[PDB]
Amino acid sequence: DNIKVIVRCRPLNARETRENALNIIRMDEASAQVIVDPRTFTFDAVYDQTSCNYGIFQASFKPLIDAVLEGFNSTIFAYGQTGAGKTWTMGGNKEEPGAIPNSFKHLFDAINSSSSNQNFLVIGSYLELYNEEIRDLIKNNTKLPLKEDKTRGIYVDGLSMHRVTTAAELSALMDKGFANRSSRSHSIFMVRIECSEVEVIRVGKLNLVDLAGSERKINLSLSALGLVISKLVEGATHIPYRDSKLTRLLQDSLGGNSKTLMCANISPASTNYDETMSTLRYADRAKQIKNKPRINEDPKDAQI
Numbered sequence: 573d574n575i576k577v578i579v580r581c582r583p584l585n586a587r588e589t590r591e592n593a594l595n596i597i598r599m600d601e602a603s604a605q606v607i608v609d610p611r612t613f614t615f616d617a618v619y620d621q622t623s624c625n626y627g628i629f630q631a632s633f634k635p636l637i638d639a640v641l642e643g644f645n646s647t648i649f650a651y652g653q654t655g656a657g658k659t660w661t662m663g664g665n666k667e668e669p670g671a672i673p674n675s676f677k678h679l680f681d682a683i684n685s686s687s688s689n690q691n692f693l694v695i696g697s698y699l700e701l702y703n704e705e706i707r708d709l710i711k712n713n714t715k716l717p718l719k720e721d722k723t724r725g726i727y728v729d730g731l732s733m734h735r736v737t738t739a740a741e742l743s744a745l746m747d748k749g750f751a752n753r754s755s756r757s758h759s760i761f762m763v764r765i766e767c768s769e770v771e772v773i774r775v776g777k778l779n780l781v782d783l784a785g786s787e788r789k790i791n792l793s794l795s796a797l798g799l800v801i802s803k804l805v806e807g808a809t810h811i812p813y814r815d816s817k818l819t820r821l822l823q824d825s826l827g828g829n830s831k832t833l834m835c836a837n838i839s840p841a842s843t844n845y846d847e848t849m850s851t852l853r854y855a856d857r858a859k860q861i862k863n864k865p866r867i868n869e870d871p872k873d874a875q876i
C-alpha cells in the first residue's frame with residue numbers, strides 16, 4: 573500500500589529561543605494533523621515537542637522492523653532542513669536512542685524470542701553518500717561503485733558486510749561508522765535479515781536513511797529524489813531512478829518491493845516558516861506513493 577508518512581516537530585532550540593523566535597506549529601495528534609500558523613496537513617501520525625524517541629519507535633517505526641523480520645524489505649528515511657532533527661531522530665544518543673539503535677534492539681529481542689524452527693543471519697552495512705560518491709563508513713573506503721544484477725538487485729560493490737549476533741554488535745558498527753561521519757551528505761545503515769524456517773528461506777532488507785538537509789553534483793541525489801517522488805505520484809511512464817545514486821539505492825523503497833515510512837522533521841520556529849512549509853508539502857506529496865511489497869522467499873542471493 574501507500575508509503576507511511578509522519579511529521580516530527582522538535583522543541584525550539586537555543587538559537588531560536590535566544591533570538592526570540594515564536595513557535596508557529598500546532599498539532600492534533602488524535603487526528604494526525606499539523607497546523608502551521610493556518611495551513612493544515614494530515615499525515616499517518618504527528619509528533620510534537622513532547623514526543624520522545626522511544627514513543628515514536630513503538631508507534632511508528634516498530635511495524636517496519638517487524639516487516640523485515642517477516643521477510644519484507646523496509647525503509648525508514650528522515651527528511652527535513654538542517655537542524656530540524658533528522659539525526660536526533662535516527663540516531664539519538666546513549667541516554668535516548670534513536671530509530672537505528674532502537675531497531676537493533678528490537679530486531680534481536682525478536683530473534684531471541686524465536687523458536688527452534690527459525691534460524692537467523694543478520695548482516696550490517698553502513699554508507700555515506702556525498703557528492704555522488706559512496707563511502708563505506710565502517711572501513712572508511714571511498715568512491716565505491718554501484719553495481720546491479722538480477723540475483724542481488726542494486727548494491728555497492730566493495731561495501732563491507734558484517735555478520736552480527738547481538739544488538740550490541742550492531743550498535744558497535746554504527747558507533748564506528750559515526751566516528752568517521754554532513755549537512756549535504758546522506759547516510760544509510762543497512763540490515764539484511766535472513767531467516768531459515770522449518771526448509772524455507774526468507775530475506776528482508778532494512779534501510780535506515782538519514783538524508784541530506786532539504787533547505788533552500790552535491791545535490792543531485794536530493795534533486796533526483798524529489799523528481800522520482802513526483803513522477804511516481806503523477807503516474808509517469810518512466811521513473812528516473814537512474815538519475816542518482818540515492819534513487820538507485822532506494823529504488824525499491826520508492827514505488828517498489830518495500831514497506832516505506834518517511835519521517836519529516838521540522839523546526840517550530842517562526843524563522844523557518846518557508847522551509848517548514850516546503851518540508852510539509854513535500855511530505856504531503858510523498859504519502860500518495862503506493863508500493864508493492866511482497867515477502868521475499870527463497871532468493872537466489874540468500875547468504876544463509
Ligand SMILES: Nc1ncnc2c1ncn2[C@@H]1O[C@H](COP(=O)(O)OP(=O)(O)O)[C@@H](O)[C@H]1O
Binds near residue numbers: 583657658
Ligand atoms: N526532538 C528533539 N528534542 C530535543 N532536541 C532535539 C530534537 N531534535 C533535534 N534536537 C537537537 O537539535 C540539534 C539538531 O538536530 P539534528 O537531528 O542533528 O538535526 P539534522 O536534521 O540536521 O540532523 C541537535 O543538537 C539535537 O540534540
Ligand SMILES: [Mg+2]
Binds near residue numbers: 658659660754
Ligand atoms: Mg544530521
